[PDB]
Amino acid sequence: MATGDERFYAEHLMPTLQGLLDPESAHRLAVRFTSLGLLPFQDSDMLEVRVLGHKFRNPVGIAAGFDKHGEAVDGLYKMGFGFVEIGSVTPKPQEGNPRPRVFRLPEDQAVINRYGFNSHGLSVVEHRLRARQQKQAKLTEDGLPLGVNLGKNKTSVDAAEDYAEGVRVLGPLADYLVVNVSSPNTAGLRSLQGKAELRRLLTKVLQERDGLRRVHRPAVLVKIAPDLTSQDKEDIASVVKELGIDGLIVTNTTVSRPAGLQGALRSETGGLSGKPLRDLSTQTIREMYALTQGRVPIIGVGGVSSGQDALEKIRAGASLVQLYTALTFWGPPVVGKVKRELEALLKEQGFGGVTDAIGADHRR
Ligand SMILES: Cc1cc2nc3c(=O)[nH]c(=O)nc-3n(C[C@H](O)[C@H](O)[C@H](O)COP(=O)(O)O)c2cc1C
Ligand SMILES: O=C(O)C1=C(C(=O)Nc2c(F)cc(-c3cccc(OC(F)(F)F)c3)cc2F)CCC1
Numbered sequence: 001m002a003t004g005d006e007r008f009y010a011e012h013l014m015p016t017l018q019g020l021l022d023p024e025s026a027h028r029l030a031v032r033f034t035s036l037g038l039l040p041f042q043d044s045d046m047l048e049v050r051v052l053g054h055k056f057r058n059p060v061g062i063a064a065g066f067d068k069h070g071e072a073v074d075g076l077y078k079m080g081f082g083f084v085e086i087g088s089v090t091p092k093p094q095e096g097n098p099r100p101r102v103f104r105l106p107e108d109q110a111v112i113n114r115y116g117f118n119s120h121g122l123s124v125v126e127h128r129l130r131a132r133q134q135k136q137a138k139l140t141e142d143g144l145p146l147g148v149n150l151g152k153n154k155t156s157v158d159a160a161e162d163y164a165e166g167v168r169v170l171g172p173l174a175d176y177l178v179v180n181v182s183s184p185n186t187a188g189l190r191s192l193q194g195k196a197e198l199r200r201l202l203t204k205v206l207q208e209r210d211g212l213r214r215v216h217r218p219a220v221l222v223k224i225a226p227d228l229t230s231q232d233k234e235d236i237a238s239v240v241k242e243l244g245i246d247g248l249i250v251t252n253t254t255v256s257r258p259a260g261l262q263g264a265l266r267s268e269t270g271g272l273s274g275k276p277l278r279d280l281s282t283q284t285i286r287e288m289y290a291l292t293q294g295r296v297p298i299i300g301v302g303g304v305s306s307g308q309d310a311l312e313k314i315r316a317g318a319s320l321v322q323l324y325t326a327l328t329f330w331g332p333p334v335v336g337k338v339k340r341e342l343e344a345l346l347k348e349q350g351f352g353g354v355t356d357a358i359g360a361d362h363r364r
């Protein structure tokens with residue numbers, strides 16, 4: 001329980017929990033427990049990384065989606081994450097798609113979800129983050145940054161304005177903002193990844209960002225999908241360097257269904273995450289890193305469940321990594337596991353630290 005044993009959670013607790021609660025109910029309880037600190041390894045200098053104008057004591061963060069409304073930020077740092085990202089958050093509140101909208105594929109160590117941006121909205125999250133704004137300031141100074149993921153409302157008419165509003169309301173409370181334009185569960189959202197659309201969108205976002213006071217000015221990253229054509233990637237890389245985008249989050253869930261999936265629910269509509277997404281995600285990181293000449297910070301996400309998974313993404317070009325689906329299968333202990341294996345792998349491979357491994361595959 002509080003001891004935090006990897007086998008117990010993986011073999012007994014998590015399985016029992018999922019055998020009694022449906023996916024969504026399990027998630028809601030997860031958020032509750034985390035917010036209350038009902039949770040079960042010391043970071044070494046080796047895991048420290050410096051990017052996006054911040055210090056990160058460890059490169060392992062919790063991907064967007066687990067804490068959509070910023071209700072468990074502190075319980076997440078306590079879980080061992082080097083940084084937390086909340087969202088996606090939409091300007092106005094919205095319920096998202098009807099239940100069921102999340103599905104487990106245990107035989108594939110994967111999950112499929114079609115939430116549709118269920119969100120409390122900017123205001124609610126704004127006040128929720130303001131209530132701990134000073135505490136976060138100290139956490140960030142301590143190497144524990146906060147990122148905020150921005151989405152857009154379903155009935156919105158001006159996609160750009162939606163993100164612009166998010167930048168104005170939550171940008172002052174975040175170390176970095178994420179323009180999420182890769183969600184597969186919102187009609188026409190991914191089309192915003194197009195060159196022309198993306199350029200107009202990011203130009204406005206960055207302008208709103210630059211208009212904020214210095215200490216409240218966040219880095220701006222763009223979260224992309226793993227289903228982009230070689231053309232989309234070239235365009236995104238071009239726009240990113242043209243506008244000075246601070247970084248990229250690679251990748252979101254995939255609408256593809258790799259041959260081999262065994263889960264009974266493999267044909268449910270939605271974005272696929274977990275092991276089946278891992279390598280497709282690592283390859284997207286490898287490609288974007290090269291297209292940006294390794295000058296644009298990348299946060300690798302997609303099927304990370306071990307130190308090896310984390311290091312392959314770092315060697316492919318990621319400065320930081322995130323995980324989510326792995327947490328839903330192995331529980332809280334997975335965080336320490338990934339960090340411990342990552343450290344051992346770095347030493348075992350001759351790297352003085354994480355910073356030394358970033359992009360290493362491209363130099364060999
Ligand atoms: C239930 C669920 C909800 C998610 N919600 C969001 C979201 O609101 N915004 C976002 O940018 N990504 C969201 N994601 C995507 C994750 O942040 C991540 O990009 C993806 O799942 C790959 O990581 P993983 O294999 O470790 O889960 C969600 C994923 C899941 C499984
Ligand atoms: O589970 C799923 O299918 C899905 C999601 C999910 O949110 N899972 C999930 C869960 F159920 C439980 C904990 C958890 C959190 C803290 C302590 C803990 O330990 C003890 F309970 F002991 F406190 C256990 C973490 C999780 F990540 C997202 C959609 C699919």
Ligand SMILES: O=C(O)c1cc(=O)[nH]c(=O)[nH]1
Pocket residue numbers: 088113114115116117118180182183184185252253271272
């Ligand atoms: O809320 C969602 O449907 C959602 C958003 C996103 O960016 N990715 C995902 O897999 N689901």
